Design a protein around this ligand. Structure first.
Ligand SMILES: N[C@@H](CCC(=O)N[C@@H](CS)C(=O)NCC(=O)O)C(=O)O
Ligand SMILES: N[C@@H](CCC(=O)N[C@@H](CS)C(=O)NCC(=O)O)C(=O)O
Lengths: 236, 236
DNA sequence: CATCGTCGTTAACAAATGTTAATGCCTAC
DNA sequence: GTAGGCATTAACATTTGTTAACGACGAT
């Protein structure tokens, strides 16, 4: 965090210079037969998947310092067919071959447990996200996703809590949840304001009252408290 | 397997005990949050979370040689409040508390990479499970879970196919998906098979034609083709 | 010699959400 | 000036959440 910044210098040590991707660009696609380990240093990215007929799916987001792996370590094959798209205007990432990495992770066990940490922090995120999205309908999905964006991308302002995501398409939010229509999200989104909770001013969302989202997505909120204390501690 | 069981008695070299867990008991729980690493070597176990309204859901079934974490290795804190209840009559699980394991993997990297890889398989599993459940809702959710049971717990008669598990009852199969009402499951299962996409005869679940299940849970099928490809090969 | 439970099925009604369409506003170009 | 992206709302089809009745089956 820390841990990440030292990992960056460890990468620059082994002669791995960073590459600067711009918005809309794909760092890797669900068709590229080569697999990478990807150290996202700064910037915001999303992980998509496109069905045979074009029906896409926004799996989750990646922000700041984190690692995304397109392939297994020992076999160096593929773990799945997904795309890593850049949401931020400009994001820095270190692109390494899987063929190395385990060479680079044999090594010195400080950065070796680091990558492991991230991977252990992912299985926890996916579980909690899979929890709450299912126990309640596509409403529960929305509040859950919003709760995520609220903590990491949120900024405390006197009018409420604004998402710093500039911009945030409404067709995009449906993608992140299960909803596949711009209309159906809007049906829910001023069914999301309300009884109590958000607001959409000038052209960005503003969170006023978090517990309504909290009680609809309890495990993600509990996940944050556990795996991400600081980012959780900022708004409680 | 062959890469799991040489890691096996690296555990009781270093002296870690083979523990016997029978049906019903929980290798860890929600309300007495203790933090282990757990090497399941044989048996079938499920991962359950219970909310305060009393609604439960099955996040996943762990079976055979696999690893389950209830704690991070660096902070040694909890990853989330969950219960590892064992579906199986049998079970031999290896309990490794967290402060232990951290450099029982510093150890020697050859068995770390095994543990690392299991997590990689987990992440890609959760994502694929998340993709297929979300896009096509509950009907998709069921077809997904069915295809999972169809593969990993698979049987072949002149049947068509079959899931080895008994004590697979529709209120629990519903729990694996989002459904909390036994009748809502029957509605689907009954409907699902004037499509004749299984038989329920002999009080167990006899599917048909994987292609119907495959078409509704594509990412899950794909996952079995990229990870655990051997298991994908028996049922084609 | 069985029964009291389960558990699966079906129907019927409240609710959510999938789907297509019509609208008026926009910045991109 | 467009032409298209996006937000919003309406009206309707389908899916589901929910409860309950009925009835079969099997631990016991
Ligand atoms: N750098 C932060 C955030 C890393 C990160 O992007 N985590 C993912 C989950 S592994 C996340 O929070 N995604 C937010 C989302 O899905 O929108 C950290 O180390 O925890
Ligand atoms: N040990 C077996 C199975 C391990 C296992 O159970 N993996 C999980 C995915 S992380 C799974 O298949 N779950 C199936 C389910 O949830 O029913 C293997 O790896 O081939």
């Amino acid at each position: 965090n820390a841990q990440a910044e030292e990992f960056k210098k460890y990468l620059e040590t082994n002669g791995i210079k960073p590459k600067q991707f711009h918005k809309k660009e794909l760092i890797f696609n669900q068709w590229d037969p080569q697999e990478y380990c990807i150290f996202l240093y700064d910037g915001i990215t999303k992980l998509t998947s496109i069905s045979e007929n074009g029906t896409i799916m926004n799996l989750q987001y990646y922000k700041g310092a984190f690692v995304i792996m397109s392939g297994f370590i020992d076999t160096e094959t593929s773990v799945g067919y997904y795309n890593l798209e850049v949401i931020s205007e400009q994001a820095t990432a270190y692109v390494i071959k899987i063929n190395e990495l385990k060479e680079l992770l044999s090594k010195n066990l400080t950065h070796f447990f680091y990558v492991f940490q991230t991977l252990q922090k992912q299985v926890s995120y996916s579980l909690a996200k899979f929890n709450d999205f299912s126990i309640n309908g596509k409403l529960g999905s929305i509040c859950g996703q919003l709760l995520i964006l609220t903590y990491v991308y949120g900024k405390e302002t006197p009018d409420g809590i604004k998402i710093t995501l500039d911009n945030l398409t409404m067709q995009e939010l449906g993608y992140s949840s299960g909803i596949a229509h711009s209309s159906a999200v809007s049906r829910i989104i001023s069914k999301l304001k309300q009884e109590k909770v958000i607001v959409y001013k000038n052209s960005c969302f503003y969170v006023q009252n978090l517990d309504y989202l909290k009680r609809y997505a309890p495990k993600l909120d509990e996940w944050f408290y556990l795996a991400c204390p600081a980012t959780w501690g900022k708004l409680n």
